[PDB]
Amino acid sequence: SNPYQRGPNPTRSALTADGPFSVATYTVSRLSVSGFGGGVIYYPTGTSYTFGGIAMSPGYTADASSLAWLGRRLASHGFVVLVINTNSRFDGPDSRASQLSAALNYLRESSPSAVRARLDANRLAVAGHSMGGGGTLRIAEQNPSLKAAVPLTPWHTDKTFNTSVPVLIVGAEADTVAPVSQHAIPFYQNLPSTTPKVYVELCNASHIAPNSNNAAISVYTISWMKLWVDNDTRYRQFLCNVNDPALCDFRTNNRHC
Ligand code: NA
């Protein structure tokens, strides 16, 4: 049952560290691609399987190296992950959406053959930090063929996204760049009530929390990607009946349980 199932039955511990797949990396040079600023692909190796893909955007003024840990973390749990650089580090959220869109096409059509051979391009998802998270919401609304969207400490001036793509948002309690009351929470509460949606808020975290190894971000991102990109119900346990001391708020419409 479930052709997309990969890796062992999960434990909470296992989801806070790199997973069972060896990871290869490929550098996409900035000038080799029109449509986005290049980036790094983290993808499984030593294996005959194919896996879903994820395009992931860094935040305002940031480089792809800022999410390198999470690009590696997700790939080692069984995903082909492209962390982009933006055409300009000053690009806003909707520009970032367009570049994720280009990056997804690139993964499908133009990435190296060793990458393409590991990818099932029928199963794609998006994630992003800050302004990259605002881009993540925009593209989920523009392109509902995406399997999941994970905005991290997201920023956008538009507060309503009418998308059917399952969304999990990570807010940071002490975030002063994109305050959760202005940004993350309105995004959560304005998504359609028929869309599977989860909001998690990190206790005592600021806007830079996604920029380094973070256990909660690791668990909830892996779990959401696994549940929706791989249809993997072994991961519902981390997302249902949640009682997590790391969190200072949790909201859900419970469609995923
Ligand atoms: Na709080």
Residue numbers in the entry: 2 to 258
From the paper:
Thus, not a Glu-Lys interaction (as intended in), but a Glu-Arg interaction, was anticipated for the introduction of an electrostatic interaction at the crystal contact: Q6E (R139) and T110E (R119). On the contrary, the occurrence of initial crystals for mutant T110E (6 h) was highly decreased compared to the WT, with the crystal size slightly increasing with a comparable crystal amount (305.7 µm ± 78.2; 21 crystals). Additionally, the mutant crystallized at a reduced protein concentration (5 g L−1), indicating a shift in the nucleation window to reduced crystallization conditions. The crystallization onset at a reduced protein concentration was also slightly earlier (20 h). In crystals with the mutant T110E protein, the distance to intermolecular R119 was reduced to 6.2 Å. Although one T110E rotamer reduced the distance to R119 even more (4.5 Å), this rotamer clashed with neighboring N114. Nevertheless, negatively charged T110E, surrounded by an uncharged surface, pointing to the positive cavity of R119, supported the establishment of a long-range electrostatic interaction. The proximity of ICCGY mutant T110E to R119 indicates an established long-range (5–10 Å;) electrostatic Glu-Arg interaction at the crystal contact, confirming the successful extension of the approach. The nucleation window shift of T110E to a decreased protein concentration (5 g L−1) combined with a 77% reduction in the lag phase until crystallization (6 h) compared to the ICCGY WT (10 g L−1; 26 h) fulfill two criteria for increased crystallizability, as defined in the introduction. In contrast, mutant T110E, which was designed to introduce an electrostatic interaction at the crystal contact, crystallized better than the ICCGY wild type regarding crystallization onset and had an extended nucleation window towards reduced protein concentrations.
